[PDB]
Motif scaffolding. Sequence first.
Motif, PDB file in Angstrom:
ATOM      1  N   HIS A  13       0.831  -1.195   0.000  1.00 30.61           N
ATOM      2  CA  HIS A  13       0.000   0.000   0.000  1.00 30.61           C
ATOM      3  C   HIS A  13       0.866   1.246   0.000  1.00 30.61           C
ATOM      4  CE1 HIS A  13      -2.603  -3.184   1.470  1.00 30.61           C
ATOM      5  NE2 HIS A  13      -3.647  -2.428   1.176  1.00 30.61           N
ATOM      6  N   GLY A  14       2.178   1.042  -0.073  1.00 28.57           N
ATOM      7  CA  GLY A  14       3.101   2.157  -0.088  1.00 28.57           C
ATOM      8  C   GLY A  14       2.619   3.311  -0.956  1.00 28.57           C
ATOM      9  N   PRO A  15       2.246   3.055  -2.226  1.00 31.48           N
ATOM     10  CA  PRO A  15       1.763   4.074  -3.172  1.00 31.48           C
ATOM     11  C   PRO A  15       0.651   5.010  -2.695  1.00 31.48           C
ATOM     12  CG  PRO A  15       2.375   2.167  -4.364  1.00 31.48           C
ATOM     13  CD  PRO A  15       2.383   1.755  -2.906  1.00 31.48           C
ATOM     14  N   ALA A  16      -0.042   4.652  -1.617  1.00 35.18           N
ATOM     15  CA  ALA A  16      -1.112   5.516  -1.104  1.00 35.18           C
ATOM     16  C   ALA A  16      -0.493   6.851  -0.712  1.00 35.18           C
ATOM     17  CB  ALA A  16      -1.778   4.884   0.097  1.00 35.18           C
ATOM     18  N   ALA A  17       0.809   6.829  -0.467  1.00 35.45           N
ATOM     19  CA  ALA A  17       1.532   8.027  -0.104  1.00 35.45           C
ATOM     20  C   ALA A  17       1.538   9.030  -1.241  1.00 35.45           C
ATOM     21  CB  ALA A  17       2.954   7.675   0.272  1.00 35.45           C
ATOM     22  N   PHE A  18       1.330   8.557  -2.463  1.00 38.75           N
ATOM     23  CA  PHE A  18       1.342   9.461  -3.602  1.00 38.75           C
ATOM     24  C   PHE A  18       0.147  10.397  -3.537  1.00 38.75           C
ATOM     25  CE2 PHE A  18       4.823   7.200  -4.507  1.00 38.75           C
ATOM     26  CZ  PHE A  18       4.759   6.103  -5.356  1.00 38.75           C
ATOM     27  N   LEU A  19      -0.924   9.928  -2.903  1.00 37.16           N
ATOM     28  CA  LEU A  19      -2.133  10.721  -2.758  1.00 37.16           C
ATOM     29  C   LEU A  19      -1.809  12.086  -2.167  1.00 37.16           C
ATOM     30  CD1 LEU A  19      -4.641   8.045  -1.442  1.00 37.16           C
ATOM     31  CD2 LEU A  19      -4.648   9.243  -3.639  1.00 37.16           C
ATOM     32  N   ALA A  20      -0.747  12.146  -1.364  1.00 33.98           N
ATOM     33  CA  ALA A  20      -0.325  13.385  -0.725  1.00 33.98           C
ATOM     34  C   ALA A  20      -0.059  14.512  -1.722  1.00 33.98           C
ATOM     35  CB  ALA A  20       0.916  13.132   0.106  1.00 33.98           C
ATOM     36  N   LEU A  21      -0.101  14.194  -3.011  1.00 32.72           N
ATOM     37  CA  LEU A  21       0.152  15.186  -4.050  1.00 32.72           C
ATOM     38  C   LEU A  21      -1.102  15.752  -4.724  1.00 32.72           C
ATOM     39  CD1 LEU A  21       3.046  13.306  -5.920  1.00 32.72           C
ATOM     40  CD2 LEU A  21       3.318  15.147  -4.235  1.00 32.72           C
ATOM     41  N   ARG A  22      -2.285  15.476  -4.186  1.00 29.66           N
ATOM     42  CA  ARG A  22      -3.521  15.967  -4.798  1.00 29.66           C
ATOM     43  C   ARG A  22      -3.681  17.487  -4.805  1.00 29.66           C
ATOM     44  NH1 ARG A  22      -8.120  11.477  -3.342  1.00 29.66           N
ATOM     45  NH2 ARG A  22      -8.867  12.092  -5.426  1.00 29.66           N
ATOM     46  N   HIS A  23      -3.215  18.148  -3.755  1.00 30.52           N
ATOM     47  CA  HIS A  23      -3.352  19.596  -3.686  1.00 30.52           C
ATOM     48  C   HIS A  23      -2.343  20.298  -4.593  1.00 30.52           C
ATOM     49  CE1 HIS A  23      -5.821  18.192  -0.551  1.00 30.52           C
ATOM     50  NE2 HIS A  23      -4.990  18.329   0.466  1.00 30.52           N
ATOM     51  N   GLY A  24      -2.694  20.385  -5.873  1.00 32.30           N
ATOM     52  CA  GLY A  24      -1.831  21.027  -6.845  1.00 32.30           C
ATOM     53  C   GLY A  24      -0.578  20.244  -7.190  1.00 32.30           C
ATOM     54  N   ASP A  25      -0.058  20.487  -8.394  1.00 28.40           N
ATOM     55  CA  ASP A  25       1.156  19.848  -8.918  1.00 28.40           C
ATOM     56  C   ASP A  25       0.904  18.459  -9.505  1.00 28.40           C
ATOM     57  N   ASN A  26       1.451  17.443  -8.835  1.00 27.43           N
ATOM     58  CA  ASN A  26       1.345  16.032  -9.220  1.00 27.43           C
ATOM     59  C   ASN A  26       2.200  15.648 -10.424  1.00 27.43           C
ATOM     60  OD1 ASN A  26       0.317  13.331  -8.918  1.00 27.43           O
ATOM     61  ND2 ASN A  26      -1.018  13.719 -10.673  1.00 27.43           N
ATOM     62  N   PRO A  27       3.528  15.731 -10.268  1.00 30.56           N
ATOM     63  CA  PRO A  27       4.497  15.400 -11.314  1.00 30.56           C
ATOM     64  C   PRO A  27       4.482  13.905 -11.610  1.00 30.56           C
ATOM     65  CG  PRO A  27       5.603  15.559  -9.246  1.00 30.56           C
ATOM     66  CD  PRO A  27       4.218  16.098  -9.017  1.00 30.56           C
ATOM     67  N   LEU A  28       3.795  13.167 -10.750  1.00 28.67           N
ATOM     68  CA  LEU A  28       3.689  11.726 -10.874  1.00 28.67           C
ATOM     69  C   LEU A  28       2.467  11.407 -11.719  1.00 28.67           C
ATOM     70  CD1 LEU A  28       5.677   9.861  -9.296  1.00 28.67           C
ATOM     71  CD2 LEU A  28       3.765   9.316  -7.796  1.00 28.67           C
ATOM     72  N   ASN A  29       1.845  12.456 -12.250  1.00 29.76           N
ATOM     73  CA  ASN A  29       0.648  12.331 -13.069  1.00 29.76           C
ATOM     74  C   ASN A  29       0.569  11.039 -13.885  1.00 29.76           C
ATOM     75  OD1 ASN A  29      -1.862  13.319 -14.274  1.00 29.76           O
ATOM     76  ND2 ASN A  29      -0.652  13.782 -16.104  1.00 29.76           N
ATOM     77  N   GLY A  30       0.911  11.094 -15.165  1.00 27.61           N
ATOM     78  CA  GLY A  30       0.809   9.909 -16.007  1.00 27.61           C
ATOM     79  C   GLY A  30       1.658   8.660 -15.782  1.00 27.61           C
ATOM     80  N   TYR A  31       2.367   8.566 -14.662  1.00 33.02           N
ATOM     81  CA  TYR A  31       3.192   7.380 -14.396  1.00 33.02           C
ATOM     82  C   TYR A  31       2.335   6.145 -14.157  1.00 33.02           C
ATOM     83  CZ  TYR A  31       7.554  10.063 -13.778  1.00 33.02           C
ATOM     84  OH  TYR A  31       8.675  10.829 -13.969  1.00 33.02           O
ATOM     85  N   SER A  32       2.876   4.976 -14.474  1.00 36.56           N
ATOM     86  CA  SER A  32       2.161   3.727 -14.255  1.00 36.56           C
ATOM     87  C   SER A  32       2.818   2.987 -13.108  1.00 36.56           C
ATOM     88  CB  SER A  32       2.178   2.860 -15.514  1.00 36.56           C
ATOM     89  OG  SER A  32       1.297   3.384 -16.496  1.00 36.56           O
ATOM     90  N   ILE A  33       2.009   2.314 -12.296  1.00 41.48           N
ATOM     91  CA  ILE A  33       2.532   1.574 -11.157  1.00 41.48           C
ATOM     92  C   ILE A  33       1.692   0.344 -10.876  1.00 41.48           C
ATOM     93  CG2 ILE A  33       3.070   3.803 -10.123  1.00 41.48           C
ATOM     94  CD1 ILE A  33       0.979   3.076  -7.910  1.00 41.48           C
ATOM     95  N   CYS A  34       2.270  -0.602 -10.152  1.00 43.41           N
ATOM     96  CA  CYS A  34       1.551  -1.801  -9.762  1.00 43.41           C
ATOM     97  C   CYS A  34       1.397  -1.627  -8.254  1.00 43.41           C
ATOM     98  CB  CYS A  34       2.363  -3.062 -10.095  1.00 43.41           C
ATOM     99  SG  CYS A  34       3.806  -3.344  -9.058  1.00 43.41           S
ATOM    100  N   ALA A  35       0.228  -1.958  -7.716  1.00 46.82           N
ATOM    101  CA  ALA A  35      -0.010  -1.803  -6.285  1.00 46.82           C
ATOM    102  C   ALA A  35      -1.007  -2.823  -5.780  1.00 46.82           C
ATOM    103  CB  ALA A  35      -0.524  -0.406  -5.995  1.00 46.82           C
ATOM    104  N   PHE A  36      -1.111  -2.928  -4.460  1.00 46.05           N
ATOM    105  CA  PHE A  36      -2.045  -3.860  -3.855  1.00 46.05           C
ATOM    106  C   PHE A  36      -3.446  -3.525  -4.352  1.00 46.05           C
ATOM    107  CE2 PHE A  36      -4.563  -5.810  -0.457  1.00 46.05           C
ATOM    108  CZ  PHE A  36      -3.897  -7.026  -0.337  1.00 46.05           C
ATOM    109  N   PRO A  37      -4.085  -4.460  -5.070  1.00 51.07           N
ATOM    110  CA  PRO A  37      -5.436  -4.250  -5.604  1.00 51.07           C
ATOM    111  C   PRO A  37      -6.488  -4.085  -4.508  1.00 51.07           C
ATOM    112  CG  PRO A  37      -4.912  -6.545  -5.689  1.00 51.07           C
ATOM    113  CD  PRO A  37      -3.618  -5.830  -5.355  1.00 51.07           C
ATOM    114  N   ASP A  38      -7.195  -2.957  -4.522  1.00 53.01           N
ATOM    115  CA  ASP A  38      -8.216  -2.704  -3.513  1.00 53.01           C
ATOM    116  C   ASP A  38      -9.138  -3.912  -3.383  1.00 53.01           C
ATOM    117  OD1 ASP A  38      -7.367   0.052  -3.080  1.00 53.01           O
ATOM    118  OD2 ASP A  38      -8.451   0.579  -4.915  1.00 53.01           O
ATOM    119  N   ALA A  39      -9.360  -4.605  -4.495  1.00 50.10           N
ATOM    120  CA  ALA A  39     -10.226  -5.773  -4.487  1.00 50.10           C
ATOM    121  C   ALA A  39      -9.771  -6.777  -3.426  1.00 50.10           C
ATOM    122  CB  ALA A  39     -10.225  -6.425  -5.859  1.00 50.10           C
TER     123      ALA A  39
END
Length: 276
Positions: free
Chosen positions: A181-207
């Motif tokens: 769930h490490g990637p949930a930390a990326f959410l911290a970038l919602r308030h403007g910016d988000n240089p991680l925009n179009g990047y692709s990643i694999c993460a723990f499926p919410d399912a």
Amino acid sequence: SKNPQVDIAEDNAFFPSEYSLSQYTSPVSDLDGVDYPKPYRGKHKILVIAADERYLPTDNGKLFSTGNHPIETLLPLYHLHAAGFEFEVATISGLMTKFEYWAMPQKDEKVMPFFEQHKSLFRNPKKLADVVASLNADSEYAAIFVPGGHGALIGLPESQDVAAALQWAIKNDRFVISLDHGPAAFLALRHGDNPLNGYSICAFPDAADKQTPEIGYMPGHLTWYFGEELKKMGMNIINDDITGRVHKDRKLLTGDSPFAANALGKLAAQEMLAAY
């Protein structure tokens, strides 16, 4: 049994079920190819952003006794350490790092000792805000690592300090490694910016953890789900299941679970080594 195990330490808190634990953990790890003939020798170190809280609230009100996953945190680090990359641990509060010790591989001749020796870094981490307060064009970091584990869902997702940190790295072309769930930390970038925009990643499926409680892995259901939220933020998630596979997207290295911990660790080692 598939019933959550009470954590006598906290109020209405539970560790995974004995069943789940025999289903998703083990006394030993899968640490594989740790041979590095020409290791790194520079000063750059691995900055780790870990969980300073062990308890996650669930939908039925209960608390899930969690934190950073031992394996997902230790294996990648073992490789980098081996490849000549030292590391510092930062936490949002400055409070000590919390691990999911119920997944810690005791009886592991390599991982366990490794932990006991560098334990200090985890028991007395720096305070991210201060770390961030020093970053500049010549900071000697090279990589930011956000180990997995449900503990990563707490605080990190909305921390302005991981926002700057994450923005410092991507911006200054550094590496960003993560799994579970490490990637949930990326959410911290919602308030403007988000240089991680179009990047692709694999993460723990919410399912997955949408179905794990059914066996007592968690004592209730998660409050929210990071997978979907990442999508809205502008990121592309590659997987819908667990398979221990890893993914590399121009400096962004990710993994889908503990099962990909070792594999991820090798990717980082190679990529960074090839970059240094």
